[PDB]
Design an enzyme around this catalytic site. Structure first.
Site, short mmCIF file in Angstrom:
data_model
loop_
_atom_site.label_atom_id
_atom_site.label_comp_id
_atom_site.label_asym_id
_atom_site.label_seq_id
_atom_site.Cartn_x
_atom_site.Cartn_y
_atom_site.Cartn_z
N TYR A 95 -24.48 28.53 -28.45
CA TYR A 95 -25.95 28.62 -28.39
C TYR A 95 -26.42 28.92 -26.97
CZ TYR A 95 -26.52 26.62 -33.18
OH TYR A 95 -26.49 26.37 -34.53
N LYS B 226 -12.05 22.77 -34.38
CA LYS B 226 -11.41 23.92 -35.04
C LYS B 226 -10.11 24.18 -34.27
CE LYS B 226 -11.19 26.37 -38.43
NZ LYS B 226 -10.03 26.05 -39.32
N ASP C 126 -14.08 22.94 -41.30
CA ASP C 126 -13.98 23.49 -42.67
C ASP C 126 -13.62 22.35 -43.61
OD1 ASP C 126 -11.78 24.44 -40.65
OD2 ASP C 126 -10.79 24.11 -42.48
N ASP D 237 -24.81 21.21 -35.93
CA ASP D 237 -26.01 21.80 -36.50
C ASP D 237 -25.81 22.03 -37.99
OD1 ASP D 237 -28.40 22.73 -36.38
OD2 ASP D 237 -28.00 24.71 -35.47
N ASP E 180 -27.22 19.38 -41.29
CA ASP E 180 -28.07 19.98 -42.34
C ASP E 180 -27.45 19.65 -43.69
OD1 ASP E 180 -30.05 20.54 -40.69
OD2 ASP E 180 -29.75 22.76 -40.68
#
Lengths: 345, 345
Positions: free
Chosen positions: A139, A185, A217, A241, A245
């Site tokens: 970001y 990851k 994942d 993020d 959600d």
């Protein structure tokens, strides 16, 4: 207990006061020493002052130990320079206090499992805290760019960036179930691998908390299949993020959720929901998220764990006996608070 | 119809043959012109040949129009150079055919909504196809690195990379519900923005398909809240990796899922599940994913949409009347196939 209250727009003033009702009740009962002041912020500030975060407020937040925020913004201010929009004020608040971690709980209140998109057996007992890194990652990462032929974005992290956010996850965990899950990851990315190695190192300083690691994942599948097995989850900016959600949909009502942002400065507690200007002044606004933010405040800013749990408890019950309209019910703002207080005293 | 069959290890041989049973049934009924040859691949190949993807096979795949793959690997080969491990053979297969798009469906079979982690009302009617970009993104992006102080990974994309995968999503959609959802991170990343602009451009060539765009974060919430509203979903490598795992949990049995990889070379159809060596030769293996891959084959490689739907239909019903053990039932491999055939003829 010096709290800065920034009521905000729309339903802010009404839901915030409901939280105050609660804080006031506890101060009396428990002799907490509560001292708060309300300051202009958001739409209201732009209008009374020409800007969303006036100096009296900035000074207000800096001299306090906690900020209780209502909701901010609305159509009324959708068309102004970004130099002075409500959203920019939020952004500035957060930067001025150098808040690097965003805390977002997702819990299924006993008996409210019916509103979850998940089967009851699976929804039952969910109580997860997602800790998201807010200042680094992709970001903000450089180099960034776009061509007519390609586009690039860099996902980069520093040891100190990972270190701080991890520290807030361990501290958050000790007050809860002392179980942390770091999400990376690692199997594919260097960044992933680096993040994992650092959290493991930091972890050595907190022998009292279990540490586990998972692939984003894999984590996504787990938040659906058996969300009831997590406590505290910590991850980077983008992964956090996505994961917040996802988790935010578990309880089935994006109106019951509080949120906290921690860092170096004064901490900020604020309901996830919007302004909902249509409802301002009608009564009827659901103060649940504002109350739950008040509770977040006791725990995270004042370490008053016992109380935060007391309040959480009260709202859990209020929700069942006098559910607000948003939950197919009739209890308005005042009605609902009253019932919370009742289980408080 | 020249198909290359690579039975693989463990339960591969048994589940693959069950698919063949089905293909053979259709060739007879519909006069399809089916011509297939079985080739060594995986654990079996390493053992008979010293390597997972021997030249006879490579030549086998290259001269065919479709590859039907069984399952590959097992403990038996967990300790060899990566130079010759089953997984490396899979990796090589995919590279030799320059397969750039990975297709992964998630569907809730009418009446099987009970196995979904979601409430029945929400699980009902799910039928989503995730199209994931497999060769680019952060997974392969340079510059990459690690220090004692920081770690970096680049998320980069070329117009031609986005273009090809998008093309497979539109083509996939025309055979389905003609509705595509492209998933990006446009609001924050340059890459996101570039991906969106390109898919919109490509889209102009397919007036017959509706195109919509969504943020990965928003998409995650939607796959839980109302997965029944999507058809085809296309996104980058990492986002597609996350979104396919998420979607993979909807139906509640990671054993019913087929998978396809498309590109420039011969397409590969393969069940998502493992080898499950414990079960090899017992009968009992659930051929559902192998059959559904056979069906993927008819649709995606041969454009035989009508048939693929016929087969899908048959398995849907087989699952209800003679559910395999994995679904709390007793129908073994042969039993189950037989019932599929029955609804075939």
């Amino acid at each position: 207990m010096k709290v800065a209250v920034l009521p905000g727009d729309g339903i802010g003033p009404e839901v915030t006061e409901a939280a105050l009702k609660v804080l006031r009740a506890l101060d009396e009962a428990e002799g907490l020493g509560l001292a708060y002041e309300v300051f202009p912020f958001g739409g209201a500030a732009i209008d009374a002052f020409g800007e969303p975060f006036p100096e009296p407020t900035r000074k207000g937040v800096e001299e306090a130990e906690a900020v209780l925020l209502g909701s901010v913004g609305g159509p009324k201010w959708d068309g102004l320079p970004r130099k002075i929009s409500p959203e920019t004020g939020l952004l500035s608040l957060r930067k001025s206090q150098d808040l690097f971690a965003n805390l977002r709980p997702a819990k299924v209140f006993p008996g409210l499992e019916r509103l979850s998109p998940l089967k009851e057996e699976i929804a039952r007992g969910v109580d997860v805290l997602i800790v998201r890194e807010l200042t680094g990652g992709i970001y903000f990462g450089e180099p960034r760019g776009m061509s007519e032929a390609e586009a690039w974005n860099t996902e980069r992290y520093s040891k100190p960036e990972v270190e701080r956010v991890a520290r807030v996850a361990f501290e958050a965990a000790r007050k809860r179930r002392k179980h942390v899950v770091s999400v990376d990851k690692a199997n594919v990315l260097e960044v992933g691998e680096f993040w994992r190695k650092t959290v493991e190192e930091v972890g050595r300083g907190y022998p009292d908390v279990a540490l586990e690691h998972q692939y984003v994942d894999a984590m996504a599948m787990h938040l659906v299949r058996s969300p009831a097995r997590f406590d505290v989850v910590v991850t980077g900016n983008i992964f956090g993020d996505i994961l917040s959600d996802l988790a935010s949909v578990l309880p089935g009502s994006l109106g019951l959720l509080p949120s906290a942002s921690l860092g170096r400065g004064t901490p900020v507690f604020e309901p996830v929901h919007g302004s909902a200007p249509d409802i301002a002044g009608k009564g009827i606004a659901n103060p649940t998220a504002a109350i739950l933010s008040a509770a977040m405040m006791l725990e995270h800013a004042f370490g008053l764990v016992e109380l935060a749990r007391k309040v959480e408890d009260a709202v859990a019950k209020a929700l069942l006996e006098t559910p607000p309209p948003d939950l197919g019910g009739s209890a308005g703002t005042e009605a609902f608070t009253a019932t919370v207080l009742r289980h408080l005293a």
